[PDB]
């Protein structure tokens, strides 16, 4: 019903993101803060593995159990892990307060034990007009990540 991810990297990006799901067939509330970001949009995705053995690279690809194309969170055609973009202000702080009905904290699409990643660049939401757009949204390198763990 409740989880948390503490985001850390090799640079200045750090944050804490909370997840809450009241019902198993209900939406997941996702909220928290990330700091140390460049002003503007940054890709925000759940990746497949909760493996930090080689930094954020070890988390592997976007969590995509249904083998779909990359999209935005509002799209029917999207990865389970496609949570779009977070927005950082001029002081580099991104306040996050979204709701999603595709991710879950239980069942086959459970994101517990997987990795939340915030990216270098904006997610183009599959609308970038190149092959990479429908794979990763061209969001670039992984600035910070954290395993999604069970919280009180």
Catalytically active residues are 45, 47, 62, 70, 79, 82, 119, 142
Per CB under 8 A, 3 contacts its own copies = yes
How many angstroms separate the CA atoms of 41 and 33, rounded?
14
Query: Which does residue 117 bind out of Zn ion, its own copies, Cu ion, none, counting CB within 5 to 8 angstroms by kind?
Result: Cu ion
Per CB under 5 A, 45 contacts Cu ion = yes
State the alpha helices, DSSP H only, in the chain: 133-136
Contact 141, 4 (CB under 8 A): no
Stretch that binds Zn ion, among 18-26, 50-58, 81-89, 105-113 (CB under 5 A): 81-89
Residue 109 annotated as binding site? no
Residue 45 annotated as binding site? yes
Residue 42 annotated as binding site? no
Q: Which of 137, 146, 5 is nearest to 71 (CA)?
A: 137
Residue 84: Cβ within 10 Å count: 22
Using CB under 5 A, list all residues that contact Cu ion: 45, 117
């Amino acid at each position: 019903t409740k989880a948390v991810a503490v985001l850390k990297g090799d640079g200045p990006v750090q944050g804490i993101i909370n997840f809450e799901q009241k019902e198993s067939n209900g939406p997941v509330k996702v909220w928290g803060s990330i700091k140390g970001l460049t002003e503007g949009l940054h890709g925000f995705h759940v990746h497949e593995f909760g493996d930090n053995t080689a930094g954020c690279t070890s988390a592997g690809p976007h969590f995509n159990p249904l083998s779909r194309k990359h999209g935005g969170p509002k799209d029917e055609e999207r990865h389970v892990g496609d949570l779009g973009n977070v927005t950082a202000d001029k002081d580099g702080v991104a306040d996050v307060s979204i709701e999603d009905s595709v991710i879950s904290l239980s069942g086959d699409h459970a994101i517990i034990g997987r990795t939340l990643v915030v990216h270098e660049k904006a997610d183009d939401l599959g609308k970038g007009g190149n092959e990479e757009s429908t794979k990763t949204g061209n969001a670039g390198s992984r600035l910070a990540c954290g395993v999604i763990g069970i919280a009180q």
